[PDB]
Amino acid sequence: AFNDLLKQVGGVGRFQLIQVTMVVAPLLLMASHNTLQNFTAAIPPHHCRPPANANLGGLEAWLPLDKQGQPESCLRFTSPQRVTEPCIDGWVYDNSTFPSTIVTEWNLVCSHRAFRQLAQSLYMVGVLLGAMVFGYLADRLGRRKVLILNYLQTAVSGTCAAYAPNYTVYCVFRLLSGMSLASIAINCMTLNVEWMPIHTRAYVGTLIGYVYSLGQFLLAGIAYAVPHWRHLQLVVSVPFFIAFIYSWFFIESARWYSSSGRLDLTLRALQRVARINGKQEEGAKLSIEVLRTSLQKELASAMELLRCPTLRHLFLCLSMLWFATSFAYYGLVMDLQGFGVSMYLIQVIFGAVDLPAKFVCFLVINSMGRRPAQMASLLLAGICILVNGIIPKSHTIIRTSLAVLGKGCLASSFNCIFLYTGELYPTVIRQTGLGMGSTMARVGSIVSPLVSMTAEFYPSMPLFIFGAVPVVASAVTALLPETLGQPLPDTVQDLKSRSR
């Protein structure tokens, strides 16, 4: 049993802590890269630029007013003061708060403001692609080698996106940066669990969710001192150059080495760690024959989830839970400008509510159960988003509190759905089901920017859609069975026995 070798070579020793911390460090900037468009693509107030030949009645005579008493964003009078025409001569952007964003740089306003959501959608497309493309590559080149490439790719793509000359190049490199960063998080949990004892896997999963939470604090601080979008994009990308330098000293997972049929590589990795842990004597006792004897016992397809009728309803129901959680999450954390409060304050509060929300989730999970915790978190998040759309924008304090509560509930749902998925699937398909569930989360983060484009015609439509989906997801949770206090299933037969 590989757990016995891990315990023999040191268990949770110096090497485990060092490698875990080094590997989990990029998760701090993971959130910054995920939600950078809140600050690099912020929309400042804008209006039609008056004609160059005309002399500034003044500016107020050239801009028609709206119902709220503000100049129209993309309408100007043909003659000074009533025929209105779009901004042929460009827009004038208020630089009091945002000196320059991709919206002001390339005029992604009005007839072109849908390009702002397309850039975020394309970045999440790379995140989905990186999960699938680099997931297969990790199983061939190893988790360490792929992590070295991902640090280089993120630094190069992030720097290149900062120096992008036009919109097309920015979208391509944002997609490329997402590909490596998606596998950075995936290979961070994979490489960590293979070097850590089975009884401490829950700590790794909890820690990764934590490091993502303090990553939201970092983005608000970084974006505050670095308001320019080109500098902000570059600043959050150059640390991966440093991570690339020290990633050469990582130790490849010994479990993967055995799966590749290379026991000599497995033995050297185990002996090297025991040197670090201070157990050279036990490491010297290990031999190639001993590894074969211990790992002999250790040594289904993704289409099985759609073939077995019992597994079908588990895969379908869990997919909606994964989709709706991420679909509503990214439709809410990527709309920080509508609450009437400073965006840096909202980002700080959004990351601050994560800590009590996950703490409350563990209390509810252990007390009432996984299913009531999943229903309550999704239903409350859906209700909070729905009420947010109904309430007028003038209630900045009330609307912010509902968004913060909804964000906390959605973050609560993310923690519960990860634990719920592990205890639902049998051990034969537990890893495949977890990967497929995370895939649907990435799909939800792709469709969410597309739904946000519907604010062109119906301003309240995205909020209604972002809120209605979690409500339906809470209903579909009732079909799932409660797993609190129940033994973990091993085969498909255990699933039928529990249902019967």
Is residue 212 a contact point for ligand RTO (CB under 6 A)?
A: yes
Which of the ranges 17-25, 138-146, 383-391, 436-444 carries the binding residues for ligand RTO, by CB under 6 A?
436-444
Task: Specify the residue, 233 or 439, whose C-beta has the smaller distance to ligand RTO.
Answer: 439
Is residue 256 a contact point for ligand RTO (CB under 6 A)?
A: no
Task: Specify the residue, 100 or 180, whose C-beta has the smaller distance to ligand RTO.
Answer: 180
Task: Specify the residue, 34 or 233, whose C-beta has the smaller distance to ligand RTO.
Answer: 34
Contact 52, 89 (CB under 8 A): yes
Is residue 411 a contact point for ligand RTO (CB under 6 A)?
A: yes
Is residue 377 a contact point for ligand RTO (CB under 6 A)?
A: no
Number of amino acids touching ligand RTO (CB under 6 A): 16
Task: Specify the residue, 258 or 438, whose C-beta has the smaller distance to ligand RTO.
Answer: 438
Q: Which residue, chain included where needed, has tokens 């209700």? A: 383
**444-463 footprint of ligand RTO as x/- string (CB under 6 A):** -x------------------
Residue 52 DSSP code: S
Among 16, 32, 34, 400, binds ligand RTO (CB under 6 A): 34
Is residue 438 a contact point for ligand RTO (CB under 6 A)?
A: yes
Burial of 76 (0-12, 13-18, 19+ CB in 10 A): buried
Q: Cα(first)–Cα(last) distance of the chain, in Å?
A: 33
How is residue 120 written in tokens? 């975020």
CA distances from 384 to 66, 343, 344 (A): 30, 20, 22
Which of the ranges 81-89, 151-159, 254-262, 410-418 carries the binding residues for ligand RTO, by CB under 6 A?
410-418
Q: What is the DSSP string of 167-221?
A: HHHHHHHHHHHHHHHHHHHHHHHHHHHHTS-GGGHHHHHHHHHHHHHHHHHHHHH
Least distance to ligand RTO, CB of residue 414, Å = 4
How is residue 236 written in tokens? 């959050």
Task: Specify the residue, 188 or 273, whose C-beta has the smaller distance to ligand RTO.
Answer: 188
CA distances from 397 to 344, 346, 393 (A): 15, 11, 10
Q: Which residues 111-150 are close enough to bind ligand RTO by CB under 6 A?
A: 124, 127
CA distances from 121 to 22, 34, 100, 209, 440 (A): 30, 11, 21, 23, 15
Among 13, 51, 197, 209, binds ligand RTO (CB under 6 A): 209
Is residue 415 a contact point for ligand RTO (CB under 6 A)?
A: yes
Contact 91, 74 (CB under 8 A): yes
Backbone φ and ψ for 236, nearest 5 degrees, come out as -80, 5
Neighbours of 249 (CB within 10 A): 10
Least distance to ligand RTO, CB of residue 127, Å = 5
Distance CA 5, CA 277 (A): 13
Task: Specify the residue, 266 or 413, whose C-beta has the smaller distance to ligand RTO.
Answer: 413
Q: Which residues bind ligand RTO (CB under 6 A)?
A: 34, 124, 127, 185, 209, 212-213, 326, 354, 411, 414-415, 438, 441-442, 445
